[PDB]
Structure formats: C-alpha cells, structure tokens
Amino acid sequence: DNRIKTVVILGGGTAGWMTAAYLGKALQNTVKIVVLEAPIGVGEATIPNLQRAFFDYLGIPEEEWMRECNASYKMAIKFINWRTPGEGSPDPRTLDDGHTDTFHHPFGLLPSADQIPLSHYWAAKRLQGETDENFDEACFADTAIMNAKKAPRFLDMRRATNYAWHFDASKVAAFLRNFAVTKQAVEHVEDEMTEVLTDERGFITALRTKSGRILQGDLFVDCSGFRGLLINKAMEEPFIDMSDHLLCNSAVATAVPHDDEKNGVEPYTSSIAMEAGWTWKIPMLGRFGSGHVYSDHFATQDEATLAFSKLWGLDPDNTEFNHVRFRVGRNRRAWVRNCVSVGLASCFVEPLESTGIYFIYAAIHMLAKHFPDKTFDKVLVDRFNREIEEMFDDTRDFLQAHYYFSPRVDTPFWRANKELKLADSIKDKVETYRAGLPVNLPVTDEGTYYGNFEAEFRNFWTNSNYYCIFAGLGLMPRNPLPALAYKPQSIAEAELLFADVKRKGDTLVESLPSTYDLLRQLHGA
Amino acid sequence: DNRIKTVVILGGGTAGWMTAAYLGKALQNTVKIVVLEAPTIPRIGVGEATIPNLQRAFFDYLGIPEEEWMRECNASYKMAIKFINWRTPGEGSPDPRTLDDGHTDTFHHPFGLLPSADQIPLSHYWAAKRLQGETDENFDEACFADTAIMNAKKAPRFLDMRRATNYAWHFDASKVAAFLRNFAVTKQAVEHVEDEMTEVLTDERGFITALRTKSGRILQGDLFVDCSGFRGLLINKAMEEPFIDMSDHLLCNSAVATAVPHDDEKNGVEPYTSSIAMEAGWTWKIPMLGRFGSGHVYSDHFATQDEATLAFSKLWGLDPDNTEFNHVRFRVGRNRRAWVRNCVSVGLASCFVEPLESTGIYFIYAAIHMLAKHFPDKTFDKVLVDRFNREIEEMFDDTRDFLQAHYYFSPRVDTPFWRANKELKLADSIKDKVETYRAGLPVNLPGTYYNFEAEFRNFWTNSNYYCIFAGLGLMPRNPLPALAYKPQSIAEAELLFADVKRKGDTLVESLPSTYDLLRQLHG
C-alpha cells in the first residue's frame, strides 16, 4: 500500500481552504487532510469558470456562497485612460477623435461568419475607413449593457450574458474553512510552524509547531504565500523573478463606501491607469474594493498612497490602507519531491486580468489529476510542473502586452515598459495578429468552454481576448485578412451579425434590471 | 485590386478536384479556377478509407448530401480499422492467430467516444482493472459498443437511416474525384483543361507565371496548386523545394494492390478497414459492395516486388500470373515547406505516409481549409505562407509519429523487417506522449469535434493512443494513481462498463447487417 494517507496544507486564506475543500471532495474520505494556519476586504475579481470548475464540484450553489462574501457581478474589465497622458482620474480623458479613453475586455463570445470571427470584419472596415466604431461597441452587446450598468441576469434569474464575480476574498476563505471543517472533517491546526523536518532524500516528513506538535504527512501543500516557507525556504527551490516582463511590484488598497442609490453598481471591474501603474475598482453592494498597483522604482509608498487617496477623494486620516510588496514570477518548479506549491507560494502576477483565483483552482485541478502515491512518480511531478509553467508564462506575456502596446510616454513608468523585451511566444502572436490572421481561435461555444476545464485551460487567451487588448490600445493589423477580399457574401453575413449585436444591446438595455436592483434582490437588502 | 485573379491547379484526382470544388465555394466567384489534368485510365479501384469529419468538413461545405456522393462511388461504412496479427509471428494470413491468453490477435481502433467518470476516461478504469488482475477483457471490447457491432458486421445506421454510431467511409477514390470534377465544372464554372503540361514558366523572382500545355495553350495564373502527385512537378521540380525523406521513421515504401470480387451474400460486409500484418509490412482490406480493395504495403529493402506479390496473392488465394496488380513506389515524408512563393502543394505532391490510419484524404481537405484561411493576395505576405507551412508540418509530423508507434510497439521480432523497426528512433514528441501514457495519465484529452479547428488541434486524442498502445500490448507501468483514492468513481465506471455491454447487446440485436444497409442505399 503506497497510498498517500495524510496531506498537510501549510497556510489558509483562499489558497489553503480552496485546496482543503477541493481535495476533500476529490479524495472521497480516503486521505486525512490537515490545514496548519496561524490564527480589509479590498476586493477580488474572477473569470467565468469559477462556479463550474470550483463551487459546482463542491455542490455549493452560486447564490449561497455569493450571499456570504458580499459578491457582485462582473461582465468585463473596463480599461480607463490607458491611451492618454496625465494624473490618475476615475473619469476617462478625451481622445483626438472625441471618444472617451475607455475600452472593454468582456467575457461575451465573438460570433463568426464563414468561420471568420466578427473581429476581422470589424478590422477590415476600420482599416478601409468604412467604420468610425470602436471594436468593443461593434462586436459585443455586453458593451451596451455595461454602459447602462444593467445586470447579466433578469430578476427571475434567467441568464442574459456571460459573467464572473466580485467578492471579499477573506469572506470566501472563511466560508470555505467552515465548509471544510464542518462538512469534510478537515483538521484545522491553529498554530505557528517552527521547523520543517526532512529525511535523507530531502522529502518533508513533518511540520513542527510552536505548541510542540510534529504534524506528520506524506504530501505537503505550500499555501504559505510569497515567503514560500516549504517550496523556497525548506526545499531551496529557486524563484524566477520576472520583473524583466512586468514592472509593478506593490499595491496600496482599501474598501470605499459607495452611494449605490445615486451611482448604481457597475457590472464590471475598472482598471484605471495611473502615473506609475493602475488602480482596480471592484464594486460590491454598498462599497467598492480598490487598489493602486505600482512599481516602487517609480513611486514611493507615500507617493502611491497620496495618488490613490487623491483618485477617490479619500480622507487619509479616516481610511485604513493595506500595503503589499509583491513577488512577480514563478518558482523554477511548482512541485519538488513531496512539496506542491499553490497560490502566491507558487507564482504571482498583478491582478490586471483577474487570474489569481484561477491560478489556485487550475493548480488544484492539476494536482487532483496528477495526484501521486508515495513513490512520487517523476513523470506525474514533471507533467504538473509543465502545466503550471505554461499557464503562468502565457498569462505573464498577455499582461506584458497591456503595457508594451500602450501609447503612453508621459511618465518614466510608461516609457520604461517599452524598453522591456517581449518573449518569443507573444512576439509570434503579435506577428500573426499584424498579418490579419486570428490568434488562437476558440475551439467550442460558451457552454463547452466555461463548462469543461481542459477546453478553457488549453485555449485560455483566445482571439477575442487578443483583439480586446490590442485593438483597445490602438494596435491594429497591418492590413485586413486577405481572404475577406474574395468573400463578398461573407462580408454581407457579418453586416447581419453587427446588426444583431445592436438589436441585442437595444433589447437587453431596455429589459434588464439595474445591477443594483439584482444585487438588492440577491442579498435581500 | 491586388487580389489573386486566377488559380491554376496542376493535377486531378482527389487532390485536384477537392481543391477546385473547395476553392470554388470559398472564393465566391471572385477568382478564375483552372484544373490542368491529362486524360488517364484509372488503375483498378484499390479502395480508400476515411475518417468521420469528411462529410461535415468537406461535403456539407459544398452542400452535397452524403447519400448522393456515396451512390456515385460504391461507398461503404467504416466504424474502425481492425488490426490482425500485429502481435504474433508468421506468414500473412487474413485469419487472426491466437495470443498466449487464448484471445484472437485482433484489436479495433474505432471512432466511438470514450465516456468519463469524475473527468477520467473509461480507458483508465479499464487499465486499472487490467493491471490489478481484475479483468481479462480487451480494451476495445470493454470500452466501445462499436466492437460488438463490428464483430456482428452490423451497420452504423438503422434502415430508417437513424444514426447508431460514429462512422466514416470506404469508396473508389477515382469515382469520388470524377464526381467532384463533374460538380466543379457544372456548378462552380471551374475550367477543366484536358492536356499535358510541357513547361513551367517562372519570373526572375522564382514565381510561377504560367503552365505551357502540349496543345500550345499557355495557362496564366497568379497562384498555383501542385496536385501532380509524388513527382511534385511544381513544388519539387520547378521550385526546387527539397523533400524530407522520413524512412528513418517508417520503412514501408511500396505497395502491390488489386480489387477482389466478394461474395457479400455468403460473407456479409465488414463495416471496417482491416490492417493484416505481413512479414515485410501489412495489407489493407477495404470492403465496398460486391468487392474489396486490398494492397500489401511493404519495404522493398525487406521484400522484392515478386516476394511481396506472392505473399499478397497467397493471402486471398489469387493466381499471381492471372491477376491485374497496381505496383506503386511511395515517397514517405514531406517537403521542407508545403507553400513556396506562389506554389502551394496539396496531396502526394506535399507529403505522404502509408494509409495505416486512413489520413490521406484528411491531409488534402485540412490543407485546402488552411489555404482558404491563409488565402493570399499578390503580395504573398511571408507571415501567411509561414503560418500555413507550420500547420502542415505539425499535422504531418504528428501523424508520422502516431504511425511509427504502430511498428515500434509491435512485439514482433520474427522477420528482419519487424526487428528493423525497433532500431529506428522515436521523435521527442511521441517519446513524451509514451512517457505520459506509461505513468497512467491521459494523452491529449478530447458532435462539436467532427468544428474544423476543434479536430485539427486535437486530432489524435487519448482514445486513439489507448486503441493502438493497448491493442499492441503496451500498458501503463501502473494505474493512474488518483484512482486509488476514488472508490465512488471506480463504482461509477462499473455503470459505464455495464452501459457499453447493454448498448452493444441492444444494437447487435436491432441493427441491420452492413450488407442490407448497403443494398438499400445503392438501390
């Protein structure tokens, strides 16, 4: 009998309790699970597969967890002032053509005509001077719905659009801890780790605690955060610093009480460009989480905190600030011997595409797939490690493109981004885009894509996502897709799709409830 | 207008007329299409087998109903390739030898989907029981109802044409090509020039400008498709693009083939292609109504043409002195680049492997799909050409690796040919997949599938690797370790195994014979 009998998780929070609850379901009461954890809600934003890939697996209905963590609805990230110079403002500046400096990255699907995405018909007309319309307004009904602050469901809870979630991550962690301890008999040891015991092979045998426990385990999950107390400190696995691709390394954050009555609730996360980074806005009922992500090479903590405060008119003497220094990059290997890293202990990028929670449940999914026995088959470990490195580096490259293709040159920070190098993989995608070709076509429709883990994991950033960011920032193809010059019938079919987007936006803006009204009903306010 | 105005296709057959008909639809009457094809006499119809996306990816695109084209090329139904005697020594026989465990030396590679329990494919629950000594049942019988249907020679549709299973097609490829020629010329205004090419005219940049014909007509064009076959008259001869010989991965380079009249009444019709292992290669059997195509694929380093023809003839009891044979020398491999300047190669002019997994027609329509996606203007953007070439090389090399695994993992060591296969090297990509398989992990986890991009990007999936590896006796080193923690999931999989048996039992009882469905289809 070579089975793992005990799994010890170091750390709580979202990483530790997502790991505990998921393995609690996956291992069907065959394995003892222990969490060792020493005893302000700035908001977290997510992507649409969180319910299908995580909560549905645990059998937790969406409304149940949402009501425990002041959750709200997200249809997109809205990028504000990424193309125009100046100080941080929550209000969009005006471009040369009179448009507000805003662009959306929605979760809505792009339809195709003749197997060519609607993006490419839009780009052909834009390049040929035949449309004045922005990509997001042309191609997604979601853009109209967001502009109206309408909800992605009706009051009868019928779905209207794709969406994900805003929530208090501390409340999600507390909710999952309660679930794991009360419904899955996970053992919660509330104590400080004082020593990692290892054998002659460098495998972890046990964690010593301050109170004198020696917690034996066969498999150790490092959820200890940026310090990597098992994977980095005990296992001596090097961390690969990737600040040569992304310069931001710090955040200052708070939660801001909000006049939902007067302002409604935006069904999207905002990414507000700053002089030395950007600021999130993550609406929830009664308040929005907000954090200024910055490079401490280009702003001091005090300078960033002052800029963040000025943005929202905060009184710095009645505001609780939370300050973090990030580690940006990933370990050389996520799993070494009998130590698997998950969450910040494994890897991190700034929350610019709301990938943090996704990286936790993707890692947990890959651990359950590659779950070992005590022989620690090197092929299982290697395949898990390859999946984590590919997932991470692909998202790192995608985030670098947000900065690299910004036209801003107004501050040392915005210029400094354009002196960095792109990795070969994203250079290849930019060249493909610049020739008018799609980048990573989607393989399926919405249901299959957000309802099968492998489908989204293998095609995570697709053509729609590349167009939203490249075209949003003003990077266009050199010329239209040449095939379109031969396809007058397909161009006509695409005109019907553009008209469908307009009619659907008109219809749903008229018929949907406000996000505020859907939230008041969900939370029983 | 910097558009291509004329496309000239050199060569007919499946490659030339599939290209003409597909571009006829894709280019919406904006481009003149010309096929230059010499008059030829079809060699005997040695039969072609296909994969299931041919109707959705190709005929449905042209608006041609399945039954209409099937009725024009004596088409029959294919639920799998059935591999015979790939594990046991001796002479070519159509009859399976007996393994050590008493089972016939047969295994199926069907198109049926593998269900999953707890996101783990049924293959992995079968492998766990097999390795733990809890089943003696073969993978194909345990995991696909299709195996029972094929063993009974039952059809994949009912006589009311309701679908029971996934399937593809057997047909006379010359008749399909003639059907598509008629369609292209009569419905899409493609010009058929029936003449021989005498010269390829090029400019100083190495672009083709025109093909001279024997009649003296000069066919001007802006884009040229090489469908000329193994001679590669445009891509290899005129453009001097080098061919990469891949006989360091696959040794077979020759075929001897014929068509055998068949007593369908007495024998029924098998709804599958057979792959019959030989001493120096293998022999296809491709049933159609009233006859089956058959060809012995061989290495002429291990068998002379005479030796191969004798062995092939002995297989079916043909008189080697009184039988009409087609003798072919293959080119195995691909061009360094499929598309050079304004010359795109399609079919045998582009690349070739032996028909061991029925991929030849797939390679044609995948190439045509990729050309329509990457369709150029007269600037011939090097990025469009490069991306097309990358797709062809990855498509080809992936299937080359998959075919090499059929030989590399055969346990046979009884002839110099079977031993010689094991001295060849596997490419890193297939070595990696075998390593993944050997750890008990899925390899490439998979209606939607048979969407072009979905199948093109995930062509050989976990079920395909299990069919071949487990068929040949290559097993994981151990079960998927996760299964040791999942008693509820193992129980769920028992219900799937029961469902396979119940569906096989039910459909073997209720389905018509392949023979009876064929008699109804062909009037």
Short mmCIF file of C-alpha atoms in Angstrom, two decimals, chain A residues 16 32 96 123-124 207 265 295 356 422 512:
data_model
loop_
_atom_site.label_atom_id
_atom_site.label_comp_id
_atom_site.label_asym_id
_atom_site.label_seq_id
_atom_site.Cartn_x
_atom_site.Cartn_y
_atom_site.Cartn_z
CA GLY A 16 -5.21 26.84 1.64
CA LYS A 32 -6.56 12.68 6.21
CA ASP A 96 -8.15 63.04 -30.51
CA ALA A 123 -10.85 45.37 -38.52
CA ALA A 124 -11.32 45.25 -42.35
CA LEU A 207 5.99 20.27 10.33
CA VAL A 265 -23.42 49.49 -9.38
CA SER A 295 6.27 49.95 -9.31
CA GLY A 356 -5.22 34.98 -9.14
CA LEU A 422 8.55 40.55 -25.34
CA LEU A 512 -32.69 44.04 -17.93
#
